[PDB]
Structure 1
Amino acid sequence: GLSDGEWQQVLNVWGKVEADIAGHGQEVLIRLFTGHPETLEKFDKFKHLKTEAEMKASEDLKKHGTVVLTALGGILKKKGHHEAELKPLAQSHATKHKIPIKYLEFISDAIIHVLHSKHPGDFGADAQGAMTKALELFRNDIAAKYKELGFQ
């Protein structure tokens, strides 16, 4: 898993996100959609977004950004003891949303991208390392639930 020192770095980095959760949330989603357009097709409520301007101008996209990061934040604060929080998410994403684990990889990298973009020179090597481990743990535990369900 992660060491205590690493969890501290992770939650320290999260303080940045918490200062503007909707902003970070919005940019993470836009980065995901613009970098991987197929991901947009998984959202029946965002498919109408034809341009990045429309994306940036969407209040509902900002709203979902808050929903997504708030959920991730609650999970990170469990520092690994997130079975109860993670299971239901893995199941709705595999069964209801049909989100391949590949997309969870995309969003993880998108989070790292947004942190550097919004905080250049203030997201150190040790910080990127700890946050990456956390996102991998999150991703890996979801992958386990996916195998359980036989979802691809």
Structure 2
Amino acid sequence: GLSDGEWQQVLNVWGKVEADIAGHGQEVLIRLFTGHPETLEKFDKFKHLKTEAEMKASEDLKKHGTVVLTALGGILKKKGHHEAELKPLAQSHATKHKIPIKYLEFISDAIIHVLHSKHPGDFGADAQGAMTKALELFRNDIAAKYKELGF
């Protein structure tokens, strides 16, 4: 698990995303889409955006980026006690949305990437560490609920 120093390190860095949730989420989602075009075809309200320009001008995209970073933030604030908040995300993405855990590993990396691009030289090596372990916590706990329902 994660220690309290690591969690505070995780929630410190989340102070950077909250200051611009629409900016960070937009860039996270665009980073997932162009690096992994197969993930875009899971979004049927973004399936059309064929270029990085359209995706950057699209505002339903910034909206959804806000709701993914809003909902992911609220889980990190649980500090591992996220079962109530993760459980319903685990099930919508397994049954209803049909989202490979691999794509949850894709966006995990995108989030780190987008932090470095947006905060180079003040996203420290311990803070990356911390943020990685909780994004890996987050995925492993989705994964358990994926296998439980055979996804």
Structure 1 portions without partners, runs of 5+: none
Partner deviation per Cα, 1:55-111 (whole Å, 9 max, x = no partner): 000010000000000000000000000000000000000000000000000000000
> In structure 1, the residue corresponding to 2:41 is in which secondary structure?
helix
Offset of residue 141 of structure 1: 0.1
> Could you state the TM-score of these two structures normalised by the residue count of structure 2?
1.00
Offset of residue 113 of structure 1: 0.1
Partner deviation per Cα, 1:1-39 (whole Å, 9 max, x = no partner): 100000000000000000000000000000000000000
Distance 1:54 1:120 in 2: 26
Number of equivalences: 151
Distance 1:43 1:95 in 2: 15
Structure 2 portions without partners, runs of 5+: none
Offset of residue 50 of structure 1: 0.8
Offset of residue 46 of structure 1: 0.3
Distance 1:86 1:129 in 2: 22
Distance 2:36 2:43 in 1: 13
Distance 2:150 2:7 in 1: 31
> In structure 1, the residue corresponding to 2:80 is in which secondary structure?
coil
Distance 1:55 1:19 in 2: 22
Offset of residue 137 of structure 1: 0.2
Offset of residue 128 of structure 1: 0.2
Q: Which runs of 4+ in 1 moved over 6 A?
A: none
- Paired-residue identity, %: 100
Distance 1:127 1:150 in 2: 34
Offset of residue 136 of structure 1: 0.1
